[PDB]
Structure 1
Amino acid sequence: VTKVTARNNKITPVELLNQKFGNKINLGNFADAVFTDAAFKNVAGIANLPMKAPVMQVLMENCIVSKYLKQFVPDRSVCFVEEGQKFYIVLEDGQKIEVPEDVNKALKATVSDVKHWAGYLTEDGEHVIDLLKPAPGPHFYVNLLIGNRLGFKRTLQTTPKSVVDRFGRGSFRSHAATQVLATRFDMRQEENGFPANRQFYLYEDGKQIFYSALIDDNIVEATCKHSCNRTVIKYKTACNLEITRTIFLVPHKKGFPLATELQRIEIKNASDKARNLSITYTGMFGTGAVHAIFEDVTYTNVIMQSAALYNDKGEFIGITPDYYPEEFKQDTRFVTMIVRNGDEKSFPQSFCTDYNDFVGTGTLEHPAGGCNLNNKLNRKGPGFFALGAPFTVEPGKTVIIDTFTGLSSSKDNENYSDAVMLRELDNLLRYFEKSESVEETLNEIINFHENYGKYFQFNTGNKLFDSGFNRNLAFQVLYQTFMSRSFGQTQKGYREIGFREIQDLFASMYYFINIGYQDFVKELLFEWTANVYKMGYANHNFYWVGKQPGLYSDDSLWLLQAYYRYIIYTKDTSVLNEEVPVADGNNEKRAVRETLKAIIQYSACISVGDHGLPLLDLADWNDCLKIDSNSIDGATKEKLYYEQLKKTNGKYGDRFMSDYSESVMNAFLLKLAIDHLAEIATLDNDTQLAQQMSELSKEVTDRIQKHAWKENFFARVLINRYKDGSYTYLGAKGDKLSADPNIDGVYFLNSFAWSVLSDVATDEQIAIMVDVIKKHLLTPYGLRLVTPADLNKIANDTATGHYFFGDRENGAVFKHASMMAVAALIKAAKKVKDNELAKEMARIAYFMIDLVLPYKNLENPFQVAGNPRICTQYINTDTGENIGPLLSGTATWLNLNLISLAGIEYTRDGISFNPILREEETQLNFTLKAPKCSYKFSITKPVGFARMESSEYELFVDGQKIDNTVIPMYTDEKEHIVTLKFKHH
């Protein structure tokens, strides 16, 4: 027997359709096709579609069309062609046959609005999704909801988060990986949570008429609306019922439970007769013993039971899971329902807590015992629940059903017990007693996010771009500030906060400072600073406490960038005097200034190699550069360094002798950190530190230029353990480590990116590196991280590849690294003397940006997939598809790059204004917010590339012409108009 893989099947159905029917009928620009048999010999297809879409998949789903096609498809190839609003089927012999009337109607209905099969974005950037259409990808129809713990304790560690799909499916978490609603770990990326979560059934006379997660013949229209931090789903039934589901997380208030999700269900009777209905709201609680799910499911079942909840009047209101083991009694979950007939209030009348009893002989979509619940409290788990309530809807009236699903934790209370949960639940239910309270809370959420996004507002003509930046990107930046990489559609494991993830704060910081939350930014800075050891290295991860001390060599250097941004923007140098605990513990404290100095010393004097550059250690920002198999962490290095000092009679600050490899990216980060510290010291009137840092910066730049530049590129790694000279560096021409015979040497994008960002590379080096990037690192789908490399030569135990070509490490386009490179290109284009080179870099930067903007994913959704409102991780260079997860560094650097392209850069003297517009653009207007003032920026130019470095321009501030391009930060609480006009040449 023989085997044929998916990738080895060269001929696609569309190619075969083009071959068979290309020269006989007009196939248009896009068409769809499907093989009619397992031999891949004949195809059935449809021609002239507005865009690529799985039209044949939907057509085969139709009984009439399938029946009609069955008389040709098995043996003959057919194609559908529309002429004069009339459909014909074309065979391989040229026969054109008019299809019957019913087939014609079915085809006309199907091909209608094909361009909207993936939904569309409103003027506010909200995604409107049809529930009956195929999904471009597992992440396309996903929305992320977050809580609000601002003004409370451990904001990062206690903010609730949730993921909601087009049908309301997903999971809900409270802190770390604590599950309120069960998460599903299965084979499919689409299944994030237990299927029963957030779903409900409506019964009329004991017979099911509605299920919230099934679109049947009784539903005439069903749509979902994904917006910022809330989801709305609307159904219309053939029996004239209007159903509206609104799902959102409750912002925290004093006395509330730690996590609470609210779903409001509005049932409106659009008929002229009163209807007596019943609602059954189902769900599944998440288990406390997550590990046991994979080890002992019986253990998870037998350690918990169900309990009923009653109010002060003795009426059943909800269910909770009760755990025996003490470790699982520190969190208490709850679900409650309330029914409002305008002003009358009623509570659920029945409940079920057994999945087997609920489903019975039916299925989850058609449960056999879904209407009449047995009211039996299960003695075991899992925490499945269903609450049933009857009600009556008068003609033209509406009934509301509010469901609160939440969790109380000991992480926010002392002497925690179930009594605490009961008290917090009582407070929550008292707060949401009136019907209008829910609407007020929703409006509060909406207004909070609208106001948060007002730090920077684009006002161009492109409504989609304006909405995507002003609302969607700002919300994603806030989300990645609170969570880092912990939760998502396919991010379901337990993850701690990585030290370098402070990169997120690079952007969100500004927003937070402009809604009066500067103290929150300071607290985040101090929390990160608390994870730096006395020597200078930092913990790699931390949620409640740090771990993995000094495992990676780059972690500590991002803190300098964060502090520089904060201090430059706010001018608040007092943070340097704050006493923060050191990661070593023992109740020792150190000033922030000393911690920054220690970081610089560790990365510049102690942990350095033979060439004076920082050591690679286990790895750096790039986790695949595991060159040294005998690497050591921070603590081992510290003890060995002290032993060396004692033995050699050295002094603290001397180099730690070894033959380990050196990282050039770390060298660039160190140079940038030293420059930032020099600027901070200058702002702090510390002249001695400023001049010392300036001299150290010059020394480090000289070392990098002398040892890292290799006549074609900046090397990525310097190798020191091969005395014979077989291998000495990696990441430039002549390194002898290229796995591609057509490429002489390996090239890393980060090399060029952070050589430009650190301000080490010169103009000639920038030009050479840009040429190399265009030659090798630039692909039709963007800038790839690195060219193929054969690391087995220098690291024998490097293992082999894990991914097909184009996926992740096998030549994919990582959007985070590409965005960093785009930042470097933007920075270079502002100051490079050569105008042609600047124009080329600007073109490359805009080309790369166009591949990352989420909204543009809706241009060809069924080819690029991704998500039209949330940034994804990487692009598959084999197919061009955008692949999750939804949380990554793409959003932060995209926001920074878009703001910098507008010309905004914060320096010691104010805003350094230097916009770089698109060639086709002729106008750019935006509004900027600042503590104590605001700006209205307008830029005008003719068609073509224009920049302040090599173009004639006029700049006015408040109507007064000015010469210097640095606009001061005003403090008069007024709005200042800035106008730039590029003269036509």
Structure 2
Amino acid sequence: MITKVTARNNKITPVELLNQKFGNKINLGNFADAVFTDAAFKNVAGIANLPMKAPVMQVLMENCIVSKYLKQFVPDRSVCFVEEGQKFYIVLEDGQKIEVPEDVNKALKATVSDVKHWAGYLTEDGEHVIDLLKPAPGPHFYVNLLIGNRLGFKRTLQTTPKSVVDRFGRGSFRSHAATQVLATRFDMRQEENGFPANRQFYLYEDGKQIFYSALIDDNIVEATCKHSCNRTVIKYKTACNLEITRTIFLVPHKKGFPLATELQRIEIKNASDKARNLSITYTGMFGTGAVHAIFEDVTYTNVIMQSAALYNDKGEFIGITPDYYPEEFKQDTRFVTMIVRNGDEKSFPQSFCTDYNDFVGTGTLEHPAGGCNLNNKLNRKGPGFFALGAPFTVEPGKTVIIDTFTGLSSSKDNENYSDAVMLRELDNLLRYFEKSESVEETLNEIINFHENYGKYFQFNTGNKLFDSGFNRNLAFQVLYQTFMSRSFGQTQKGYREIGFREIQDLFASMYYFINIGYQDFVKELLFEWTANVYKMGYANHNFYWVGKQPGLYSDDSLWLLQAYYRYIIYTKDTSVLNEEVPVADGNNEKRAVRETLKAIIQYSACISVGDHGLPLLDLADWNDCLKIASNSIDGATKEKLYYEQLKKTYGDRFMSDYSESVMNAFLLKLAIDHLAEIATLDNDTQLAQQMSELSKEVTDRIQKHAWKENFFARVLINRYKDGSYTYLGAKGDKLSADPNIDGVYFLNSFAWSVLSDVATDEQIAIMVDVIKKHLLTPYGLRLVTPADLNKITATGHYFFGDRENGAVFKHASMMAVAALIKAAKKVKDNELAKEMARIAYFMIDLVLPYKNLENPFQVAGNPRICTQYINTDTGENIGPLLSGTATWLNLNLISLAGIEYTRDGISFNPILREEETQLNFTLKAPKCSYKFSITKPVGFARMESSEYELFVDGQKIDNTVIPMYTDEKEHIVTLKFK
């Protein structure tokens, strides 16, 4: 009787209906916008010929003049606005073209003025300038990510502060782990990361509110946000002629500082001919220490704390701290302080509120009723809401500066901890920043540290958006992910530990740290990860202060050999192999890095193998949503069963019918090759020979049992005596959920068969054909083809296009691009190479953040930060902002530029775009420098198949391995393809 129509099942869209109605009467262009005028969807109001997709109608319908005019026609008639000439006209299905009245025309003209830049634009330095009134392409588009700096201090990974900042400065701020300084919000909308008050302030004049930092009213004439590397600057101009600048950054750690401090500087310039007496109220919400109790017992979170006030030596109020009763929430101590700088004079706040209800009173957060006159009452309960007040006079043409310091001290950086330690550290912070210029100097330390950091690799091309995008923005993101893994962002808000696997981030950032003198830090990290390997060779799946989930996932330890291979090959520092690092098993057991690397290979090569001598899948490997195994087991559980098996009968096979992971075999084969080269370089001929032979034995196992006519299988299945299911991931697996596709195909089977150097040239060609047929979509390379794994009872969680139901997972797509690039350099068939390169560049174009500003309202994403996946139904780039995408994009762009590090130096083999005639970049090495220049005619060119000349400091060279020089001089490398 009643009918249901879903958003996806709805037939025509508004724009398609507009075309059906007006397509043969006016030129609609190729972009238009429209909305249905009624709940039944029979008519549309639209606007024609836009320069790109944009929600123009929704911005128009905010205008009162325009909605009144349309009301004469809508909802009972369809309509389209057209600028046919330079006046606007309204057009009806009945042919009429009516000139709209002058005020409607003024408003339409103004609305459609700057549509090309509604999502903002990028400066030449890669910074995102955003208008605060314009709509958002999506919830991650207008977001920036900040990070502190604890390099050279205790426990860098675990103690580096981090925050998220949107275009109005909203969001939140953390110290160690998921410790909240400013309150995170866990609610319905992705846009709401923080409690709304966080970082916001009000200005008053004569008892009247005239400004709120997060409300654009008629008093605001200009309002812009600029997101840069590790700071955000938000600028306003009011009609009363004030110029307000908010600058937000995290303080780099110094001796004696709190573990975490966020600095917001507020500059207020009076651009008028008269002095003005104003007051500022600065607001925010401290995070609770009892995060779980937010869901389970909110009253608890409130009663366990009370507000407290801070006073200096002269009895002057300076700030607020939330005081906790339970000892478990007393190991961190939060604070907020404000300094008002009026020329010479510095002063502190004169009033405060610590109760949200008294502050808002009868009004709202945008217009609080108790916001000017603060009651100075310390709240006996939480939550830790604060409001700090101060009056001040700004003389004509002059500026007053308000510096706020918000932060946390912690036992994690201090022995014998109490709140006394916070008080000392806060004093150190405030003394260090007594001078006004002290803040500008630190901001410039930050800017310069990051500019310096990126100089490991600089592109210098005819495209400043790409250059700045890689040279600054991507460099920063790969730094960020080295410290933060996947643990914090706009929509990453829950507690996450560091994934053993996510040592991948170090694959890219390594070279950056080494080249600004932090080689010991990279060493530190290798060792921290190495301490999470058990004697038997498996790894803790996660660790933070301490490791957990021992050998839960089969792949983890294998990643470590790539990290070490990368470090040792680059620095030649073999001494790392003799280091005695704790084993994850505990006691006080230590083991030489060398013997650990041998144990990891032995676990996957000899012990935890299946019927075909390939590594066991266990619960799962890299692919987390591939859960099959009938009664998988831990590494600890396996260890105990392994030793009983040995009694009932070290290094022999653990017997079982468990499935085998082909991906792991590829990781293993690569790991072994890596160890061989390492041994050779370490002058250990026996280990090098042993591993070299083991590499051949594993290659033959894969080639014989995993190549399935079409593709490398993903999983080998051994538990059906039946022979009913034998493998998954190639033709004849009998597991497809698409009738048009025989078999299931995983992108990583291809990617790792090439990255491990197992696939022959004929097999690569074959797999590339399959990929073009079935994994390549108009939005890139999807992870897997549709599968029916129920045959070995879980249903899907996602509509088509999202995540595991057919998305382009950009991290996996970049691992596949790495394989394509590697193959394009080596395969004999130049035509195959050309095509693999085309695919690589096609996929890179879909991932480069800056390109999200071409068609931002369809593609969304974030123009400075890589996002996780592309919805294959809409093309939208979907968060989170932290993923393996940035790491592998970085590696890939450097690979395309031709840089690969080997034992004898740099193997130089660039693959440029067909249309490029020139590529230039600079490269730092620890004890030298390089300038590279590559020229070629239009068309596909590579060293394996084109004529070329290579010069190093003007001397023609036949050897394409360029040595790592140590003379501290800049070396000119020139490559001319004929």
TM-score under structure 2 normalisation? 1.00
Q: Distance in 2 between matches of 1:83 and 1:744?
A: 54
Q: Distance in 2 between matches of 1:316 and 1:474?
A: 42
Which residue in 2 is equivalent to 1:785?
Answer: 783
- Deviation string 1:523-544 (CA, Å, 9 cap, x unpaired) is 0000000000000000000000
Deviation at 1:343, TM superposition (A): 1.5
Q: Distance in 1 between matches of 2:627 and 2:287?
A: 38
SS of residue paired to 2:620: coil
SS of residue paired to 2:770: helix
- Deviation string 1:196-225 (CA, Å, 9 cap, x unpaired) is 000000000001000000000000010000
Q: Distance in 2 between matches of 1:636 and 1:438?
A: 55
Deviation at 1:83, TM superposition (A): 2.3
Aligned with 2:694 (options 693, 696, 714): 696
SS of residue paired to 2:83: strand
Q: Distance in 2 between matches of 1:779 and 1:257?
A: 50
Count residues in correspondence: 977
Which residue in 2 is equivalent to 1:818?
Answer: 813
- Deviation string 1:123-157 (CA, Å, 9 cap, x unpaired) is 00000000000000000000000000000110000
Deviation at 1:627, TM superposition (A): 1.7
- Deviation string 1:822-844 (CA, Å, 9 cap, x unpaired) is 00000000010001100000000
- Deviation string 1:841-896 (CA, Å, 9 cap, x unpaired) is 00000000000000000000000000000000000001000000000000000000
- Deviation string 1:74-117 (CA, Å, 9 cap, x unpaired) is 11111111022110000001101000000000000000010000
**Are 1:973 and 2:968 an aligned pair?**
yes
Deviation at 1:625, TM superposition (A): 2.0
Aligned with 1:664 (options 658, 662, 665): 662
With 621-630 and 745-754 compared, the bigger mean Cα shift is at 621-630
Q: Distance in 2 between matches of 1:891 and 1:363?
A: 41
Q: Distance in 2 between matches of 1:343 and 1:891?
A: 46
Q: Distance in 2 between matches of 1:342 and 1:141?
A: 34
Q: Distance in 1 between matches of 2:701 and 2:648?
A: 28
Q: Distance in 2 between matches of 1:343 and 1:32?
A: 55
Aligned-pair identity in percent equals: 100
- Deviation string 1:353-385 (CA, Å, 9 cap, x unpaired) is 000000010000000010000001100000000
Which residue in 1 is equivalent to 2:977?
Answer: 982
- Deviation string 1:694-744 (CA, Å, 9 cap, x unpaired) is 000000001100100011100000011111211100000001111111000
SS of residue paired to 2:899: coil
SS of residue paired to 1:67: helix
Q: Distance in 1 between matches of 2:837 and 2:571?
A: 30
Deviation at 1:237, TM superposition (A): 0.2
SS of residue paired to 2:171: coil
Which residue in 1 is equivalent to 2:368?
Answer: 367
**Are 1:923 and 2:918 an aligned pair?**
yes
Structure 1 residues 714-753: aligned runs within 5 Å: 714-753=712-751
Deviation at 1:312, TM superposition (A): 1.0
- Deviation string 1:357-415 (CA, Å, 9 cap, x unpaired) is 00010000000010000001100000000000000000000000000001000000000
Which residue in 2 is equivalent to 1:631?
Answer: 632
- Deviation string 1:280-331 (CA, Å, 9 cap, x unpaired) is 0000000010000101111010010011100111100001000011100000
Deviation at 1:342, TM superposition (A): 1.3
Q: Distance in 2 between matches of 1:480 and 1:659?
A: 38
SS of residue paired to 1:400: strand
Which residue in 2 is equivalent to 1:770?
Answer: 768
Q: Unaligned 5+ residue runs, structure 1?
A: none
Q: Distance in 1 between matches of 2:391 and 2:184?
A: 30
Deviation at 1:629, TM superposition (A): 2.5
Which residue in 2 is equivalent to 1:485?
Answer: 486
SS of residue paired to 2:425: helix
- Deviation string 1:736-790 (CA, Å, 9 cap, x unpaired) is 1111110000000000000000000000000000000001010000000000111
Structure 1 residues 346-425: aligned runs within 5 Å: 346-425=347-426
Deviation at 1:122, TM superposition (A): 0.3
Which residue in 1 is equivalent to 2:304?
Answer: 303
Aligned with 2:683 (options 655, 662, 685): 685
Deviation at 1:921, TM superposition (A): 0.4
Q: Distance in 2 between matches of 1:332 and 1:485?
A: 26
Q: Distance in 1 between matches of 2:160 and 2:433?
A: 21
- Deviation string 1:621-670 (CA, Å, 9 cap, x unpaired) is 0012222131000001000000000011xxx0000001000000000000
SS of residue paired to 2:475: helix
Q: Distance in 1 between matches of 2:138 and 2:925?
A: 40
Q: Unaligned 5+ residue runs, structure 2?
A: none
Q: Distance in 2 between matches of 1:301 and 1:335?
A: 19
Q: Distance in 2 between matches of 1:739 and 1:191?
A: 38
Q: Distance in 1 between matches of 2:444 and 2:343?
A: 20
SS of residue paired to 2:541: strand
Which residue in 2 is equivalent to 1:279?
Answer: 280
Q: Distance in 2 between matches of 1:406 and 1:627?
A: 46
Q: Distance in 2 between matches of 1:632 and 1:756?
A: 30
Deviation at 1:905, TM superposition (A): 0.2
Deviation at 1:276, TM superposition (A): 0.3
Q: Distance in 2 between matches of 1:932 and 1:658?
A: 52
Q: Distance in 2 between matches of 1:10 and 1:478?
A: 46
Q: Distance in 2 between matches of 1:511 and 1:433?
A: 34
Q: Distance in 1 between matches of 2:611 and 2:275?
A: 86
Q: Distance in 2 between matches of 1:725 and 1:210?
A: 74
Deviation at 1:10, TM superposition (A): 1.9
Q: Distance in 1 between matches of 2:709 and 2:232?
A: 55
SS of residue paired to 1:86: coil
SS of residue paired to 1:53: coil
Q: Distance in 2 between matches of 1:85 and 1:446?
A: 46
- Deviation string 1:450-495 (CA, Å, 9 cap, x unpaired) is 0000000000000100000000000000000000010000000000
Deviation at 1:250, TM superposition (A): 0.2
SS of residue paired to 1:541: strand
Q: Distance in 2 between matches of 1:931 and 1:355?
A: 55
- Deviation string 1:573-597 (CA, Å, 9 cap, x unpaired) is 0000000000000000000000000
SS of residue paired to 2:975: strand
- Deviation string 1:142-183 (CA, Å, 9 cap, x unpaired) is 000000000011000000000000000000000110000000
- Deviation string 1:7-37 (CA, Å, 9 cap, x unpaired) is 0002100000001000000111200000000
SS of residue paired to 1:453: helix
Q: Distance in 2 between matches of 1:396 and 1:36?
A: 51
SS of residue paired to 1:49: coil
SS of residue paired to 1:605: helix
Structure 1 residues 569-580: aligned runs within 5 Å: 569-580=570-581
SS of residue paired to 1:765: helix
Q: Distance in 1 between matches of 2:376 and 2:633?
A: 60
Which residue in 2 is equivalent to 1:82?
Answer: 83
SS of residue paired to 1:916: coil
SS of residue paired to 1:363: coil
Q: Distance in 2 between matches of 1:871 and 1:836?
A: 31
Q: Distance in 2 between matches of 1:24 and 1:180?
A: 59
SS of residue paired to 2:39: coil
Q: Distance in 1 between matches of 2:98 and 2:581?
A: 81
Q: Distance in 2 between matches of 1:345 and 1:858?
A: 43
Structure 1 residues 24-103: aligned runs within 5 Å: 24-103=25-104
Deviation at 1:73, TM superposition (A): 1.2
Which residue in 2 is equivalent to 1:158?
Answer: 159
Which residue in 2 is equivalent to 1:872?
Answer: 867
Q: Distance in 2 between matches of 1:835 and 1:738?
A: 33
Q: Distance in 2 between matches of 1:50 and 1:775?
A: 34
SS of residue paired to 1:83: coil
Deviation at 1:964, TM superposition (A): 1.1
Q: Distance in 2 between matches of 1:243 and 1:596?
A: 57
- Deviation string 1:919-943 (CA, Å, 9 cap, x unpaired) is 0000000000001100000000000
Q: Distance in 2 between matches of 1:209 and 1:30?
A: 40
User: What is the root-mean-square deviation of aligned Cα atoms in Å?
Assistant: 0.5
